[PDB]
Amino acid sequence: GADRMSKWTSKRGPRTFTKSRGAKKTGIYTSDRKFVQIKEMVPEFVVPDLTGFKLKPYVNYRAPAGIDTPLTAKALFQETVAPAIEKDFKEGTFDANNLEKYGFEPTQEGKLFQLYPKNFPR
Amino acid sequence: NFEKHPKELIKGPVWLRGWRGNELQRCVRKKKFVGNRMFIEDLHNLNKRISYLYKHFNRHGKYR
């Protein structure tokens, strides 16, 4: 006679049964049943200063939209790194070892914002 | 010049092109040609269909 089709949540079951609704944990439970919040585990919203901002939620109809071109890795490379290498190649001051000079990162370890695996949320 | 028998022009199931028989024979013939390429449930039903027909045609009927 139990309803099998309804979702299993903490409102149901005895007192002992509990579970989260998806809220991210922000602290630790120490011995003796004491909660110790950790400030670093609490997200902090980085909010910019909007003074002098010239952009509003809606855009004018008169303004014409452009052609959609999903950005690709090749396109970014040509814009940023290709010109430096091209000029350097003419000057001859280019070597395989110093690709980092143009911005190459050998490993993501040591970066605050690791590209992969991502260590930063949206 | 008898190059092709007319039976070769029939379009139908592989196990009964140019052949005719009663259902029990038809059941066994379907198994022979495509017994190894049949689905599990279809093969199970065919096996049961054969066993039913066998006991009917070989143990029942008005004439002995």
Binding site: - | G21, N22, Q25, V28, I50, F57, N58
Partner: protein, 95 residues
């Protein structure tokens, strides 16, 4: 009797008949006399003489055996020196 066999779909011969009866192509069947090898020491000489003979079958018995045997056992067999050569045909019978 197996009227329709699974593997081939044909009628099956009963081998109890093949081992007891001989069919002549005309349609007659031959058989032995039951007990011709049994307790011969208490049977009379005339009694034993009858048993040794080969006997024919009736229309019903012949009809039965024809249902229990397949056509292969009803064909013509051209055996050289056959001791049943002359008996496969009926002659001077009006009926």
């Amino acid at each position: 009797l197996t009227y329709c066999s699974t593997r081939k779909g044909k009628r099956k011969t009963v081998k109890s008949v093949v081992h007891r009866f001989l069919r002549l192509h005309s349609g007659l069947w031959l058989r032995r006399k039951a007990g011709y090898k049994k307790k011969l020491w208490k049977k009379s000489t005339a009694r034993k003489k009858r048993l040794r003979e080969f006997v024919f079958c009736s229309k019903t018995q012949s009809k039965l055996l024809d249902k229990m045997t397949t056509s292969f056992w009803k064909r013509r067999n051209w055996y050289a020196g056959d001791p049943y050569q002359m008996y496969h045909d009926r002659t001077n019978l009006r009926v």
